[PDB]
Design a binder for this molecule. Structure first.
Ligand code: CL
Lengths: 11, 164
């Protein structure tokens, strides 16, 4: 992700 | 028949090599056109000189934040954000090029290059290209990442543009 990066495998 | 763009990657200022991508303009023309134009610099801004800010070995290398260099920034050629064009293409393996986002319909300039199949991102991230040449360079980039994504050296797009 672009802003709030969360746990697990996200972009 | 689809366009091709390149990145020349550097590590702490030292050239590493070239990565070229095929952009699937036949399937996601708006999203391909964004990345292509950001790579040529033709709107007066783009990827040249930007860094890969988040590299997670075994997952992906994320870049394209050429405004804030940390994930918080980036802008498309259409405006700050654009819609998810479609989800026709899937995250089928290493070398897939796909959009990073902040939820639905928030595409800007940030992208990722997969170093594995990342199927759980299907239907949530727009896939729009694939590495054509230089996957060895991408594998070399992975060496500078970490589990939380922070890089051990500065990985830059020293130059970029269009080949074909
Ligand atoms: Cl160019």
């Amino acid at each position: 992700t672009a802003x709030x990066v969360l746990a697990x495998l996200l972009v | 028949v689809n366009p091709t763009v390149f990145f020349d990657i550097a590590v702490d200022g030292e050239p590493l090599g070239r990565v070229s991508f095929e952009l699937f303009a036949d399937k996601v023309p708006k999203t391909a056109e964004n990345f292509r134009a950001l790579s040529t610099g033709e709107k007066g801004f783009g990827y040249k000189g930007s860094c890969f800010h988040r590299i997670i070995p075994g997952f992906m290398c994320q870049g394209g934040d050429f405004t804030r260099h940390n994930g918080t920034g980036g802008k498309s050629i259409y405006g700050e954000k654009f819609e998810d064009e479609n989800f026709i293409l899937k995250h089928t393996g290493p070398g897939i090029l796909s959009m990073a986002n902040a939820g639905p319909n928030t595409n800007g300039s940030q992208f990722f290059i997969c170093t594995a199949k990342t199927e759980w991102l299907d239907g949530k991230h727009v896939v729009f290209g694939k590495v054509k040449e230089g996957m060895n360079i991408v594998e070399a980039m992975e060496r500078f990442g970490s589990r939380n994504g922070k890089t051990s050296k500065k990985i830059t797009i020293a130059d970029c543009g269009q080949l074909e």
